[PDB]
Amino acid sequence: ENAIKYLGQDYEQLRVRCLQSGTLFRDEAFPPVPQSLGYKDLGPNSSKTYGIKWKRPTELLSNPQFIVDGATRTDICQGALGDCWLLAAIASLTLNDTLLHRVVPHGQSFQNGYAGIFHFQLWQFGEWVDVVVDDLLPIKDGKLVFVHSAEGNEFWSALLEKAYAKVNGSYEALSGGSTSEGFEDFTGGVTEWYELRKAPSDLYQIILKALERGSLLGCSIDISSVLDMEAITFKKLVKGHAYSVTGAKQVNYRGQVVSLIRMRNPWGEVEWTGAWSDSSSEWNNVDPYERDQLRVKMEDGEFWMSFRDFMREFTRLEICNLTPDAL
Ligand SMILES: *[C@@](O)(C(=O)NC1CC1)[C@H](C[C@@H]1CCCNC1=O)NC(=O)[C@H](CC1CCCCC1)NC(=O)c1cc2ccccc2o1
Ligand SMILES: [Ca+2]
Ligand SMILES: [Ca+2]
């Protein structure tokens, strides 16, 4: 019920100590040094680390905020790191309000009570643990190098990504991964995998129920070989790339009931251009209320597809349920 302290570090104790001492926390466990960034691609002498510096948000802007207009999936915009699986897990997590509020302790701020330390809860090896970080973040050309919010002064997702790097020993360790790991590390649940070509006839209903329960869902397109990793298709889907599944709804359309599914590219941009895409003409033949409820004309990485097209274009689905045997 109460989280174990990762590496014995006590968030409240350290915060109060720094606050009374008039100093900012510096994390001995995960210091702002090259090793923290990485070892090969992000290694000490890699050109990928050119110009990277470590700065706290308070050393960057005037009024840095932890959470702005809520901690939501639009705050998850991938940086220069191969951790799409993890960022898709975070975006999916934001749809489960209870779990989101466990992983991200709200009420942390850069104002009252600030001592340069933040904390997060992660499910690790069968137990919840509390991971602290200092708020030094990798910056290049004045901007965050890795994950960032669409809101430039919002830092909760950057700090959560840093905490996850910390438990993995470096940012580079997060490059290339499996969405199921992030889902489970944020929920304590277990993921079931679906091969779309061989799915049960009621997969759409399974997806609806799972989204309703607050389960976490993701999807992806298989790669044919190494060199079509991250290939962008003609209709602007990305292969070998973790997407969050963020919604589903049936609408009346041309005399039939059509099932739609909504998903989000953790890039926060580059979307499907086919039927039910933000600017597609299908929305012209949908009820004006349902159109207003579902359709958002915004280059934000999130878009709708018909379930038929979803089944045609994507290859895999993952569903991470918290209590799969007790619904
Ligand atoms: C994401 O698409 C991503 O982060 N994209 C932004 C960088 C542009 C990554 C890209 C991947 C990262 C490593 C370097 N080159 C790449 O193409 N894609 C993955 O991480 C991919 C996601 C999974 C999610 C669920 C099934 C589909 C694929 N996973 C891997 O590439 C991967 C996973 C894994 C597990 C163990 C060992 C290696 C390994 O690689
Ligand atoms: Ca926000
Ligand atoms: Ca969109």
Side-chain angles (χ1 to χ4, degrees), residues 200-209 211 245 247-263 272 275-277 282-283 285-286 290 294 303-312:
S201 71
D202 66 331
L203 190 56
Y204 188 76
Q205 280 309 318
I206 292 167
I207 289 170
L208 279 169
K209 304 336 152 65
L211 282 164
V245 168
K249 233 255 191 142
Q250 295 187 314
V251 298
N252 284 329
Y253 177 84
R254 298 201 181 231
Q256 314 187 8
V257 170
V258 167
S259 307
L260 309 183
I261 186 162
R262 182 177 72 194
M263 91 196 44
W272 170 247
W276 312 93
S277 50
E282 278 79 12
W283 298 107
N285 290 116
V286 134
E290 305 247 312
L294 311 182
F303 55 85
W304 294 89
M305 299 181 70
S306 77
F307 188 69
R308 176 170 190 98
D309 281 332
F310 173 75
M311 293 302 284
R312 200 162 183 266

Side-chain angles (χ1 to χ4, degrees), residues 78-87 174-181 193 219-223 226 228-231 238-243 265-267 316 318:
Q78 190 159 12
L81 183 58
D83 68 336
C84 61
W85 55 280
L86 178 66
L87 302 185
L174 307 174
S175 107
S178 314
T179 305
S180 56
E181 184 155 17
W193 295 275
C219 63
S220 68
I221 301 147
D222 282 8
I223 60 177
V226 162
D228 91 319
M229 304 166 53
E230 217 74 344
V238 182
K239 304 195 166 188
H241 187 62
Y243 281 80
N265 178 351
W267 289 351
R316 325 257 157 203
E318 291 126 332

